[PDB]
Structures are given as structure tokens and as C-alpha cells.
């Protein structure tokens, strides 16, 4: 429930703002299909996109899933930040990424 409370708190603060190896393991989530793929450091963003396209056969958006640290990964920088977050966490063992289609 730890992850749950932390989510519900995130949702609350968001709505209340209505108007005022050392390989990186990425857990991919696409229509209930978990897929864990490891990436060696240094992890390149375009290679991750490349991997998604191959494995899942269609262009998918990467939604980094971490309550108020969640973000649409659009660039090397975004990814490195997610990777850093995971490095400094005591509980997380993988980067969680929800896959959605842009259209």
C-alpha cells in the first residue's frame, strides 16, 4: 500500500492544483503485458525507443511512472533523471514505463 498512498497523495496535490550488473532494468507496461528489458550503461534514449518499436511493433510513447516524478520521456535528459531517481531509491529495482499510443 506504500505505492498506493504515495499515488493518492500525488493525485490529491495535482487536483488541488485545479487552478491554484549496473544495467538499467526497465519494466515495460503495454495493455497489461509486462516486459522487462535490461539496458547497459550508458543508456541511450534513442536506443530505448528503437527497442520499443522492435519489441512491440509500433511507435509507443514512454510514460515514466513515479507519482509526482512521472513524465513523458522525450529526451536523453528526461531518461537520465529517471535513471538517477532509481539509483538513489532504496525500494525501486526497475524503471517503470507505461506504453501508450500517441494516436
Amino acid at each position: 500500500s506504500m505505492d498506493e498512498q504515495e499515488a493518492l497523495n500525488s493525485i490529491m496535490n495535482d487536483l488541488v492544483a485545479l487552478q491554484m550488473q549496473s544495467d538499467v532494468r526497465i519494466k515495460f507496461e503495454h495493455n497489461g503485458e509486462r516486459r522487462i528489458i535490461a539496458f547497459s550503461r550508458p543508456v541511450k534514449y534513442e536506443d530505448v525507443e528503437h527497442k520499443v518499436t522492435t519489441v512491440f511493433g509500433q511507435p509507443l510513447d514512454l510514460h515514466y511512472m513515479n507519482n509526482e516524478l512521472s513524465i513523458l520521456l522525450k529526451n536523453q535528459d528526461d531518461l537520465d533523471k529517471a535513471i538517477d531517481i532509481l539509483d538513489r531509491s532504496s525500494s525501486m529495482k526497475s524503471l517503470r514505463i507505461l506504453l501508450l499510443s500517441q494516436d
Binding site: 493518492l8 493525485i11 495535482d14 487552478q19 511512472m65 513515479n66
Partner: protein, 78 residues
């Protein structure tokens, strides 16, 4: 603000009807929308994640959507 209760009832609905994972997933999308994402974008993401069984979630979210985006969110209903 008189709508503090209307937030708690919505939080209550989420806590009581959504699985733990569906909450983390939703929190994540909701954070993107909060942080500058379009409404059209947000809706597309919701539609891929929440089918018929999760109408209440979408509905209960409506009054929390600002007027200008609200126009698009309502038609987004089935």
C-alpha cells in the same frame, strides 16, 4: 473553498474502486496533464487505459477540469 468535500468524495471513489496499480498509472497520467500536457493528449491516454468499467473515474474528474479544456473533455465521453 466549498469544494474541498467534492475532492474528498472523488479521492474516496478512487481509493475504493481502482486497483493499486491503476491508481499509480492514473496518478502518473494526471501528473503529466497537470504539468502542461494538452487535454486532447490526456483524453487519448485515458481512452487507451480505461474502458467502459471505468466511466466513474472519467466522470468524477470533469469538474476538476478547467472551463476551456472542459469543453473538449465532455464530448470525450462516449
Amino acid at each position: 473553498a466549498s469544494a474541498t468535500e467534492l475532492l474528498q468524495d472523488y479521492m474516496l471513489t478512487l481509493r475504493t474502486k481502482l486497483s493499486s496499480q491503476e491508481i499509480q498509472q492514473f496518478a502518473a497520467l494526471l501528473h503529466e496533464y497537470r504539468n502542461g500536457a494538452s487535454i486532447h493528449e490526456f483524453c487519448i491516454n485515458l481512452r487507451q487505459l480505461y474502458g467502459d468499467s471505468r466511466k466513474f473515474l472519467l466522470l468524477g474528474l470533469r469538474p476538476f477540469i478547467p472551463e476551456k479544456d472542459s469543453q473538449h473533455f465532455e464530448n470525450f465521453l462516449e
